[PDB]
Symmetry: C5
Subunit: 273 residues, 5 copies
Amino acid sequence: QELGNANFENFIGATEGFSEIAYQFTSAILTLGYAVMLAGLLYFILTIKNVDKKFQMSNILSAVVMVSAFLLLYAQAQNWTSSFTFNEEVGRYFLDPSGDLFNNGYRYLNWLIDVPMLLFQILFVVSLTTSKFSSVRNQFWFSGAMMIITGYIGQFYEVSNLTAFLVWGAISSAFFFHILWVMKKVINEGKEGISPAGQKILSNIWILFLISWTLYPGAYLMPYLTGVDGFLYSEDGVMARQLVYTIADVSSKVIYGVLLGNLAITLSKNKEL
Amino acid sequence: QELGNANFENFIGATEGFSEIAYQFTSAILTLGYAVMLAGLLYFILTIKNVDKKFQMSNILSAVVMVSAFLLLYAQAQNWTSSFTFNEEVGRYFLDPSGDLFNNGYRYLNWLIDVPMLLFQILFVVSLTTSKFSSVRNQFWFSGAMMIITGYIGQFYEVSNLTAFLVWGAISSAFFFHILWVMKKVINEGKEGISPAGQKILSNIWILFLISWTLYPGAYLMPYLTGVDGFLYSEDGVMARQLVYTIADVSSKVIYGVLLGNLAITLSKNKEL
Amino acid sequence: QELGNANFENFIGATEGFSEIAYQFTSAILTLGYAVMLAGLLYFILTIKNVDKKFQMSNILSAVVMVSAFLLLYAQAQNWTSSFTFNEEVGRYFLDPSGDLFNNGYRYLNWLIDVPMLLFQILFVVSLTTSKFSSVRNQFWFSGAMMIITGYIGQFYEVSNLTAFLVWGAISSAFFFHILWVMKKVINEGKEGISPAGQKILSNIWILFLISWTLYPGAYLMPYLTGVDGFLYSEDGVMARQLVYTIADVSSKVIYGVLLGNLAITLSKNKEL
Amino acid sequence: QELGNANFENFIGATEGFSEIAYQFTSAILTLGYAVMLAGLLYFILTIKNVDKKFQMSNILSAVVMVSAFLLLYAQAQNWTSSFTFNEEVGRYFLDPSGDLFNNGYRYLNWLIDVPMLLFQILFVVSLTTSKFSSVRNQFWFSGAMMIITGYIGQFYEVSNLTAFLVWGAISSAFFFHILWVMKKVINEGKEGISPAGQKILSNIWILFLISWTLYPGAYLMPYLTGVDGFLYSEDGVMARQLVYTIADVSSKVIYGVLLGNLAITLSKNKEL
Amino acid sequence: QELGNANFENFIGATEGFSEIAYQFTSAILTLGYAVMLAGLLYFILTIKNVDKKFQMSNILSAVVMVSAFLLLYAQAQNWTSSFTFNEEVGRYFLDPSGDLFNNGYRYLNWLIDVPMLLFQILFVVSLTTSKFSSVRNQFWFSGAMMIITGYIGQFYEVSNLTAFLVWGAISSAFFFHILWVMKKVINEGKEGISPAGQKILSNIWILFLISWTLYPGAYLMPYLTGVDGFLYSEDGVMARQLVYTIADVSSKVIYGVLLGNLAITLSKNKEL
Ligand SMILES: CCCCCCCC/C=C\CCCCCCCC(=O)OC[C@H](O)CO
Ligand SMILES: CCCCCCCC/C=C\CCCCCCCC(=O)OC[C@H](O)CO
Ligand SMILES: *C/C=C(C)/C=C/C=C(C)/C=C/C1=C(C)CCCC1(C)C
Ligand SMILES: *C/C=C(C)/C=C/C=C(C)/C=C/C1=C(C)CCCC1(C)C
Ligand SMILES: *C/C=C(C)/C=C/C=C(C)/C=C/C1=C(C)CCCC1(C)C
Ligand SMILES: *C/C=C(C)/C=C/C=C(C)/C=C/C1=C(C)CCCC1(C)C
Ligand SMILES: *C/C=C(C)/C=C/C=C(C)/C=C/C1=C(C)CCCC1(C)C
Ligand SMILES: CCCCCCCCCCCCCCCCCCCC
Ligand SMILES: CCCCCCCCO[C@@H]1O[C@H](CO)[C@@H](O)[C@H](O)[C@H]1O
Ligand SMILES: CCCCCCCCO[C@@H]1O[C@H](CO)[C@@H](O)[C@H](O)[C@H]1O
Ligand SMILES: CCCCCCCCO[C@@H]1O[C@H](CO)[C@@H](O)[C@H](O)[C@H]1O
Ligand SMILES: CCCCCCCCO[C@@H]1O[C@H](CO)[C@@H](O)[C@H](O)[C@H]1O
Ligand SMILES: CCCCCCCCO[C@@H]1O[C@H](CO)[C@@H](O)[C@H](O)[C@H]1O
Ligand code: NA
Ligand code: NA
Ligand code: NA
Ligand code: NA
Ligand code: NA
């Protein structure tokens, strides 16, 4: 079967197919994904007035990200169930091309909302010291866009051309490291002149940010993290990838948003935790 | 026909099929389910300002659970009608694998929202005495997650491997008992220093919690509660399971939420009930 | 063919089929139904602040019923168009079992929201004199539930077993009469110590309640109201049943809610009609 | 082919089929339709507080009509694309009876919301002089209902029985003329004792009302406005009908609502235009 | 294969078909499109109170455009995936006429909302000096309508009749130039008597407006921008067209709306950036 520049899910699905557990788990984990985002949307809107006016733009940008993540994860949850269909004879779910091939790239282009807005929103909670708002924003948005576009191109070749996959992935990684560098500066400057309570929260936000964002390139490589014909080049790797995405999605978007809201509360004059 | 690690609904549906009453009832009871959750969402939002600011987070977390439960019960209602199709010759609804096998596991992963948030929200209404907020929260969330994940694994084997089904179910039960233990403490400490009216409501909340949460392991075992080849290993057991889920869903989420809101009103300075 | 315990719509649809007028009218009347409920939801939310705080729970419960009625009528509108498909050869719409059989029972289980909440909400507008709030509520909810459950069982046999249909219907009717009895008391006690304007509205509410609620058992019997092989055991009876439901739905839920809102305004200190 | 009492769209679609332009335009014009109504819903809600409390009911009734028109135009937009399917051999869209026949009657029953509420809402902005509120309302609602029901019956026969089509249309027209008569009185009485600004707006509202409402009987007759085998008994007439509906829908509902809101602002003590 | 007056996407799709990258990218870029508009809707509503009352109509009109753009881009995203289906034998997505032909004209009719409202909303932020509000509005709306209708007609012939395509496009362009002329005046007059900060924002708005609006005629011509049998008369041109639309949509609607909101804040007495 000719699949071309398609994600490895389609190759596993076309050859071995997916067990009940693999198929039902991947559907459920994506469903949890979009459910968390819509619940988060409600949470971020309803808690707007829990912080001083100046901090409320962070609640609004969290809500903006929730809308993006909900729409994408909802669409992708339906894409999963449309792309793989039960074969009665063998009792496994095989590629159903009438549904279209499954593509993780769907996520990447919506990151053009998520990444820029997640990086931007912290600049409405913390105060910079030596760095300029417009400068940090421009660095975040440029490197964010380049990271996403290069990775988007790469993931199309994860089976068809491992070399292109790894080269584009490496270029994307360079921009990622730049973002990590700039966010560390923002966290450091953010800690300057705020309560120890606020500083603790920013320490947690940095760890959360570092781990949650690194999970995305982890998901990128997932099928090959056990090498050629490894344990993960299987339905187990398919499950692992969507699980990692969902953990990353909840952590990078919702928990990040909640911690920023808690920081905003400590920095708020009237409010306290 | 090879169904593998699938719920017993698919076996009944593939062999005997479902009568009009069994099929139509299961569809209607799931439809009532998601209708209650969306109505509950509206109720919890519209009554936010009926309690003092400090208590409003409980309304918000109720709303969060309503969103999760609505999305899941809506999706599962469609899953039911897609998985079983009318056979004109015999006049019963049989497994339609083109719709996918039906899986109750869909519910379990969304409990990673419901369970943590339901257990958390009471800590925004009652005041603890001897117990520490962070400690109760961490115990609820850890044991909640472990209870859900172990049960999720178990239910895949409810037909294919009764031993795995019962062992995973037993491990899950251990974590459940821990949750019951911690919640009893929270209720007791919550009663200390509040009006007799508030204490009565917490007594009711404990009974509701105990019964409603115990229904879930009841739903887990449903097909085997009348032993091998029992009355319940049938379309009658299929009906019973979804009925028990719906009673549990309405009770554990909505009625629990309403009682907590009523408690918040008694604890509120301005409000009287 | 073998339809078993199915509503008469499926028998007419399987034997005679439906004319363009019968099929298109039934679809349109259900569409009007769900449109009225969603419009009503908007109305009840937007007019919350038109009455004193104490009366606003009635607006909220109206909104809750609108959500239930919208979801059900929307789902049932789609169920109608899925269950009957055009036959080009004869130019009529015949039963399409791939869509499932059509079941009015879908409505009944959602009444477990509508009936309890419609009966409850008046107790937030009128003041009782001799009767106790908790007692009236408990009688409404018990008899409401029993009325619904017994009728739900009955309607499955409306073709397959006329005896069961009529016996279950009669038992259901007994609980209905109890509800009528209790509501009459509530209306009388509500009239005590309020303006003549408020008393006139409660008189209207009683007439509306009596007629609108009686339409439901009317819909139950519809196919047999012209006896065996009567005018109504036909596509004309199918049209009549859904028309009666829609009139009953609009009257019992929306107009009832509007009149209660108008009563709340007269009873409100600041507000005036 | 046997189509029975069906609209002429189905006859054109079954015999000639629709060109790319005819099919794509009819889909797009209905899509614009429902888009305008949902945008209008947002506008009428967001501008509620731009007028004195007493006038806000008019914003609410505008919103109610937006919900009705959105739901109907959305459903009808999907009905269009389901009822006509591309034939590769000839390159035109032909009747696809599996989707159901297309029926304009779908619109008519939703007018039982639109007509009564559009006629009602002006009575919350203007003050009557010689006429009684309840009397004008009752005349509007009775004649409105009769106009709709008689026309609804008529449109089923627009091909199958031209005589019935014209007779029912004529009866409907009589009730329409009554509505025009009553609305002219309302406008005249509304002009009495208000600013020149308010009087100008009521003059505009009358012209808008007269033209926009007359478009509906225009749409009714559309296929025959160029006589037997005329230019309009074609895909061009199909396009014209839905175009006229969309112009009528936007004019009679949204622009009417906006002008009433502007009138409310001029009549408002605090507010200025 | 006879496609008639259809867009070039259908010809490429019917002859060469689309690679995984071409098909998946076009789906993702449209998905990003509608996601941005729904996120924008939330943003424009939530930031209404960030500007003085007089400026809030601009937030409302932004929201109005978001609803239109969301609905259209969502519908068009589904139209893309319905119109092209995977062929297992060659591994490309080919025209699936059962889904309907793909038409960009769908966008054009919704511009009857977007264009008039985008041009209107600036007149609620800037103050005119020489020019009259009603006059600028009328010129914008007339030329906007004529630009859209002439272009709408043109795009049907982009393959079937290049002459009609170019002539209608040229006529449309004339009206576009008129709009550019009037908007330049509005921006110049808007700069008069406001802070240098506000003037800088209007300079940005003019560049954004000029580039973003010019992208639409760019999308119109896209397939022929590399001449006959050029690089762009291919799946690469199909990708380019939808990419350009999405850049234009985000830029002309959301970024334009955000900049107007920022201008409104600078012009607001209480508020500051
Ligand atoms: C191929 C391997 C790629 C190598 C990895 C590259 C990582 C660093 C990239 C860019 C550094 C700075 C780029 C800045 C982009 C312009 C935004 C900006 O800095 O302007 C702010 C303005 O001055 C208002 O203060
Ligand atoms: C955050 C929670 C995620 C939980 C989800 C679990 C998914 C497991 C993912 C990665 C583990 C694999 C790490 C790779 C270490 C194995 C290295 C190896 O096996 O060798 C490579 C091979 O030999 C060279 O050819
Ligand atoms: C909620 C969305 C978020 C936080 C998105 C984050 C995305 C990344 C950190 C992506 C990084 C990548 C690399 C570093 C290399 C491979 C390609 C990417 C784009 C997955
Ligand atoms: C609204 C969601 C709620 C309250 C979820 C509750 C879930 C449980 C109490 C689950 C318990 C289980 C066991 C104790 C054993 C079998 C497996 C479970 C997970 C069903
Ligand atoms: C909006 C929902 C409402 C008001 C529901 C009302 C339902 C009833 C009054 C049902 C009554 C019935 C009988 C008295 C006999 C036959 C069975 C029932 C349930 C239809
Ligand atoms: C937004 C909905 C509106 C304003 C509906 C208006 C409907 C009419 C004015 C209908 C009139 C008709 C006639 C006068 C004759 C033919 C049948 C009708 C119902 C189309
Ligand atoms: C968000 C919607 C916007 C900004 C729409 C803008 C539309 C145009 C500027 C269209 C211009 C065209 C021409 C100048 C020639 C070809 C036809 C058109 C309509 C695409
Ligand atoms: C308090 C408000 C009172 C409202 C009274 C106004 C009456 C409007 C109700 C309309 C009912 C029309 C019934 C038509 C009967 C069907 C006949 C159709 C002819 C074939
Ligand atoms: C940095 C992590 C990337 C390590 C590269 C591992 C090389 C994977 O090797 C690939 O494995 C596939 C599935 O097992 C095989 O089908 C391919 O033939 C093979 O190229
Ligand atoms: C706590 C309740 C669990 C007790 C275990 C019950 C044993 C059920 O045993 C199983 O029953 C199935 C259906 O009856 C049969 O098809 C299986 O062959 C049998 O293993
Ligand atoms: C109180 C109202 C109940 C009246 C019961 C009427 C009995 C109807 O009798 C039924 O009529 C059907 C329709 O033709 C027939 O098909 C059935 O064979 C017949 O039993
Ligand atoms: C405008 C109100 C009067 C219209 C009456 C016009 C008579 C139309 O006449 C009809 O035209 C159809 C289409 O050409 C034909 O198919 C029918 O045979 C014919 O009866
Ligand atoms: C301003 C830009 C207008 C340039 C129009 C000239 C291009 C028209 O060239 C067209 O190319 C198509 C494929 O490329 C062919 O199928 C057509 O037959 C041919 O007319
Ligand atoms: Na599937
Ligand atoms: Na089904
Ligand atoms: Na149908
Ligand atoms: Na179609
Ligand atoms: Na497709």
